[model samples]
Target: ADFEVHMLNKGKDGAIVFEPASLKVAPGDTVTFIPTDKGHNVETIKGMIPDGAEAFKSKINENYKVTFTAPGVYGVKCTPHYGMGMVGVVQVGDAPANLEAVKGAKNPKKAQERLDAALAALGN
Candidate 1:
């Protein structure tokens, strides 16, 4: 468990956002989606997830935990905040050790460039 996202309610009582927004996880790790307050649901999307994963058919709530088994990228978005960029990503597995190499890599964007370069170098 890295950290928990705080689901905040906003806008006419129909909006939610996961604090920190995004995170990365290694395979075999788990994420517990907890509601800071209430009136929210966590639905896992099928086609929107990595291979061997199912669709948006499960609803998660406070104290709910989901274990990501595969190695890939996954996202969680609040239903009401879909239009407000209330989306988060969970990067599973050790994609690479590029983060260390990108430290102080010239411009700030250089870090992203380094990561992209590493991913491209992996060729998938």
Candidate 2:
């Protein structure tokens, strides 16, 4: 089975957040960002939000999963609270496969749109 990493809250508000905020994974691997509590999302950005990427929308939900089949790096931010520093990075590569990399990835906001999209795709 694949490893699982949890998105938890360290702030006083008890809101879920990714601990590491960045990770690198191998192709064919999936990173599932699960919220410790509830209400979050995942949004892919063309660039930093301060740039034109700010206009990019999000795929929101609580339990979100993203499979990386391509070899590239991507940035993601939370739609509602991206300004709050709720963001994450994923670097995908083609190699022997690294479960550790997948286990180490993190996303704090865990956007609802991301989760919704995952569920919709998975038919859950």
Candidate 3:
């Protein structure tokens, strides 16, 4: 199956973020990150991806598609607006298989904060 997440200037409850900030998918699904506004790029967060999964990033204003072949939680952020909490989470399968590892991953203060919020929003 295919899912989409919109990178937006204004989103849920009037926040500057990715609409639907969190998603759930099964293995073999694909996620397409679409930029609804300019100046946004999608990148995978370090230490937040499942084992054997390669990280990826898209150029500014470029739409990107990622295929999930493993079961875990993946963190994605807009590099330019990460400090503003422009982040999201993708949960593959029923639970986050690497939740602890991801939670323990070293991250910049702002990035970690935003990631924490995003994960919490997903009830992780």
Candidate 4:
């Protein structure tokens, strides 16, 4: 199935965040990351995406779509707000085929924390 995640400021203080921080989709499914706010760009974390999947980054305020062809966990983040915990997860299939590798990927502490939290919420 197809899914959409919105990037926006969730609070009056303008805290940037991703709605539905954790998403589950089957292989071949696509997720559209829509920037409802400016200055936000979506990017796949290095070493956090499944093998054979191409990593992508979108221009600021642009909508980005990624098709999941492999079964694994993908860590996604907003480049400008990564340190502010602007991160999310894309789960392809039921199991995380590259969970360990994705967890091992180097990232800012907050970004990693957010990813870990999202995965935990997904019960992974």
TM-scores of all predicted structures:
0.59, 0.55, 0.87, 0.89
Give the candidate number with the greatest TM-score.
4
* Candidate with more favorable, higher TM-score: 1 or 3: 3
Can you list the residue pairs that collide in candidate 1? 44-56, 45-55, 45-56, 46-54, 46-55, 46-56
The positional error of residue 22 in candidate 3, measured at the CA in angstroms, is 0.6
Model 3, residue 89: what's the lDDT?
84
**Ranking of candidates on TM-score, top first:** 4, 3, 1, 2
**Tens digits of lDDT, candidate 4, 23-81:** 88988888898878788888987778887888888888998887888888888888889
Candidate 3, number of clashes: 0
RMSD of each: 9.6, 11.5, 1.9, 2.2
lDDT of 4 at 111: 75
Task: Summarize candidate 2's per-residue lDDT along 13-53 as a digit string, tens digits.
Answer: 23445544556567667777766645566666543222211
Model 2: weakest 10-residue lDDT segment is 47-56
Runs with alpha carbons beyond 4 Å of true place in candidate 3: 106-114
Off by over 4 Å in 2: 1-5, 11-16, 47-60, 94-124
Which residue ranges in model 1 land beyond 4 Å of their true spot?
10-15, 55-61, 96-124
Between candidates 2 and 4, name the one with more favorable lDDT: 4
lDDT of 3 at 34: 91
Worst 10 residues of 3 by lDDT: 11-20
Task: Return the TM-score for candidate 3, rounded to 2 decimals.
Answer: 0.87
